[PDB]
Amino acid sequence: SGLSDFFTQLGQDAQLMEDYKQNPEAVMRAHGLTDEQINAVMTGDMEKLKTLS
Amino acid sequence: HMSGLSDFFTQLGQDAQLMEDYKQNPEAVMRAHGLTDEQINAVMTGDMEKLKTLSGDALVISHGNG
Amino acid sequence: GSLVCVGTGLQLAGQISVLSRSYIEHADIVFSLLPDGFSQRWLTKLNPNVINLQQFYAQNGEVKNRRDTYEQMVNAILDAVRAGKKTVCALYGHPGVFACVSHMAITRAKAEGFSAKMEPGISAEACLWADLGIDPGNSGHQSFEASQFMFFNHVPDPTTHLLLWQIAIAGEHTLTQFHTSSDRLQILVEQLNQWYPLDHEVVIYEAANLPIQAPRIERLPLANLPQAHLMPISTLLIPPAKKLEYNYAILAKLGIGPEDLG
Amino acid sequence: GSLVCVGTGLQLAGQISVLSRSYIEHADIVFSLLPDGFSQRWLTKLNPNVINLQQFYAQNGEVKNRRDTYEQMVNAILDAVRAGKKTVCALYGHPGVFACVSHMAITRAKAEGFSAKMEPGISAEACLWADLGIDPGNSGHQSFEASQFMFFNHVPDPTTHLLLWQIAIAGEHSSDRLQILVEQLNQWYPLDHEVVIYEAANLPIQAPRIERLPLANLPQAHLMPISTLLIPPAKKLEYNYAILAKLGIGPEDLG
Numbered sequence: 054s055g056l057s058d059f060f061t062q063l064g065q066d067a068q069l070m071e072d073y074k075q076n077p078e079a080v081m082r083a084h085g086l087t088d089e090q091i092n093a094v095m096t097g098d099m100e101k102l103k104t105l106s
Numbered sequence: 107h108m109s110g111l112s113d114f115f116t117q118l119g120q121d122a123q124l125m126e127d128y129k130q131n132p133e134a135v136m137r138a139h140g141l142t143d144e145q146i147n148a149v150m151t152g153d154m155e156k157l158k159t160l161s162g163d164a165l166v167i168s169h170g171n172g
Numbered sequence: 173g174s175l176v177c178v179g180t181g182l183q184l185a186g187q188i189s190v191l192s193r194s195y196i197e198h199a200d201i202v203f204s205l206l207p208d209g210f211s212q213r214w215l216t217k218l219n220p221n222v223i224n225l226q227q228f229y230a231q232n233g234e235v236k237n238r239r240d241t242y243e244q245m246v247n248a249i250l251d252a253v254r255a256g257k258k259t260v261c262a263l264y265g266h267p268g269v270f271a272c273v274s275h276m277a278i279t280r281a282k283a284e285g286f287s288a289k290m291e292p293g294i295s296a297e298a299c300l301w302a303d304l305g306i307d308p309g310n311s312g313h314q315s316f317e318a319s320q321f322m323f324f325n326h327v328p329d330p331t332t333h334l335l336l337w338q339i340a341i342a343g344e345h346t347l348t349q350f351h352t353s354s355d356r357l358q359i360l361v362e363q364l365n366q367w368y369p370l371d372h373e374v375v376i377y378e379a380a381n382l383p384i385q386a387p388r389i390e391r392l393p394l395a396n397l398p399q400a401h402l403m404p405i406s407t408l409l410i411p412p413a414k415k416l417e418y419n420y421a422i423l424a425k426l427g428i429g430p431e432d433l434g
Numbered sequence: 435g436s437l438v439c440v441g442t443g444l445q446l447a448g449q450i451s452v453l454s455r456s457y458i459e460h461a462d463i464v465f466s467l468l469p470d471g472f473s474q475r476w477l478t479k480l481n482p483n484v485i486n487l488q489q490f491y492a493q494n495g496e497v498k499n500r501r502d503t504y505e506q507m508v509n510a511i512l513d514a515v516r517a518g519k520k521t522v523c524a525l526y527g528h529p530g531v532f533a534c535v536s537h538m539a540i541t542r543a544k545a546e547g548f549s550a551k552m553e554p555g556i557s558a559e560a561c562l563w564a565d566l567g568i569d570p571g572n573s574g575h576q577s578f579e580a581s582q583f584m585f586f587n588h589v590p591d592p593t594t595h596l597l598l599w600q601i602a603i604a605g606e607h608s609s610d611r612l613q614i615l616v617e618q619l620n621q622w623y624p625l626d627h628e629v630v631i632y633e634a635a636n637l638p639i640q641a642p643r644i645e646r647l648p649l650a651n652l653p654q655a656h657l658m659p660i661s662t663l664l665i666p667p668a669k670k671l672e673y674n675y676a677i678l679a680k681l682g683i684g685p686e687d688l689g
């Protein structure tokens with residue numbers, strides 16, 4: 054899961070959203086997203102995301 | 107009772123299981139949550155204004171003048 | 173300081189989004205505008221630090237232009253933000269649908285260099301589609317504030333659904349009262365009768381606020397609207413009066429004909 | 435048994451109503467018509483007894499008509515209800531908006547004497563108002579399916595915010611069709627009128643698409659199924675001096 058579990062938590066939890074918006078990269082890595090995944094998010098490449106998990 | 111009323115409506119509004127139970131046997135479910143006779147009567151007659159009394163107590167947020 | 177505006181929907185407790193509820197729970201302070209006392213209680217148990225925006229409406233007897241009311245609400249919200257509070261504004265329904273306070277507060281917060289955003293919620297209209305069994309996507313739909321429909325030049329499409337919001341104050345020009353009169357409503361009927369027959373069936377809709385309450389779905393001829401019992405919370409649905417008409421001009425350009433419409 | 439149709443809204447996990455989520459949790463069986471795999475994974479963890487109705491669509495590049503497939507979906511739902519199961523259907527956005535299968539199933543369930551209802555959810559339109567910071571009530575609002583707008587005569591009120599949905603398939607019975615849409619809209623809107631292409635976000639890490647461009651450029655824009663066209667007002671509101679007169683007032687009396 055990972056990406057799914059993270060996206061699920063982020064989307065439901067206002068406190069996690071807060072933490073996320075302050076330092077997206079760190080929070081994503083803390084939740085076990087890969088450098089590729091993190092990069093896809095920060096670049097806004099939704100397509101590459103689909104093809105990661 | 108007043109608090110209990112509020113707490114019941116709150117749970118009922120959020121809890122699908124309780125909701126489906128309610129629709130099956132309204133009176134029974136209401137009694138099992140400690141509602142009184144007249145609370146139940148008010149529900150069954152749909153007397154919203156009584157319910158507010160029993161709990162113990164302007165919505166325009168727009169205009170059209172430009 | 174920051175501002176998040178959220179809606180709570182129409183039904184007690186259950187119609188708020190999961191994320192929106194979270195926002196209320198984590199807030200330093202919540203400014204609320206809710207339907208009733210059950211909702212108020214529920215909110216307070218979510219987050220006890222609630223300021224009720226109701227207080228800014230005109231009290232019994234007082235004459236107050238609602239422009240002032242809205243201006244004072246916005247100001248109260250911004251004072252919290254300016255003081256450094258993580259502020260949530262919790263409005264019934266959708267915080268930005270026939271509601272100015274949230275848009276105003278967000279605009280102002282942004283202008284002063286604060287973080288601000290709005291979260292969508294379930295509006296009375298979302299409820300109306302569900303309760304009446306209408307798919308507004310395919311059929312299309314229109315919305316107007318009733319008074320604005322009377323005071324300004326609006327032209328409805330009588331082939332598609334027409335919602336008039338705030339029908340209970342239709343024609344109340346001062347913005348100091350919270351109901352209209354039969355004679356005002358009668359003028360609305362006369363205005364509508366350009367497109368809709370007097371015997372056209374209309375629907376007075378009120379979404380349920382409590383889980384034990386059925387919605388109000390009152391079908392009546394348009395002519396009878398002036399005699400109807402209206403609540404501040406009432407919306408008027410006017411279904412189509414005319415059948416769909418072919419856009420011959422555009423069909424021809426697409427290279428198709430009425431016969432091909434499938 | 436019984437039927438309840440709920441929506442997930444647009445945003446993953448966070449935009450579903452509290453009660454709607456509860457309905458899924460406590461269902462005997464869930465029929466899903468969810469768009470993506472994140473959505474699917476999330477649902478499966480709420481309730482393991484999920485049937486993906488997307489399976490009924492064409493598979494392995496087979497040929498299959500929509501109307502036949504909707505019928506199979508609906509029949510699958512009703513079979514659960516008839517069997518006596520507390521059945522929940524989980525749709526995207528608002529379950530009665532751009533959704534024939536919900537309406538059909540609920541209709542058929544009622545006719546067979548089963549309890550059946552639709553729970554409202556957050557639609558793409560609800561998201562649009564929030565994201566663009568626009569109140570439909572400000573100068574009024576009109577929404578049409580773009581194709582319906584082209585095939586049938588729907589004269590817009592240009593003081594309103596006009597929304598045209600499913601812009602990506604406008605005029606399908608391409609830049610060619612969009613150009614025709616431009617010429618149509620150009621009856622009321624100048625070619626340099628700024629319009630907005632809107633796409634609601636579905637992931638919490640994802641920004642909504644809010645692309646402002648002149649009307650004339652619409653044909654050269656890349657569109658997705660979810661794309662919507664917002665056309666802001668081309669005219670200010672103007673006083674209805676007739677109705678004001680009937681009301682015995684003037685513009686100066688408007689508080």
Ligand SMILES: Nc1ncnc2c1ncn2[C@@H]1O[C@H](CSCC[C@H](N)C(=O)O)[C@@H](O)[C@H]1O
Nearest residue numbers: 265266269295296337338378379404405407
């Ligand atoms: N329960 C309800 N049923 C029907 N219409 C309702 C309603 N609650 C509010 N409205 C409509 O909204 C108007 C108040 S303005 C508040 C709108 C609210 N933010 C929302 O999204 O619904 C009423 O005059 C009526 O037109």
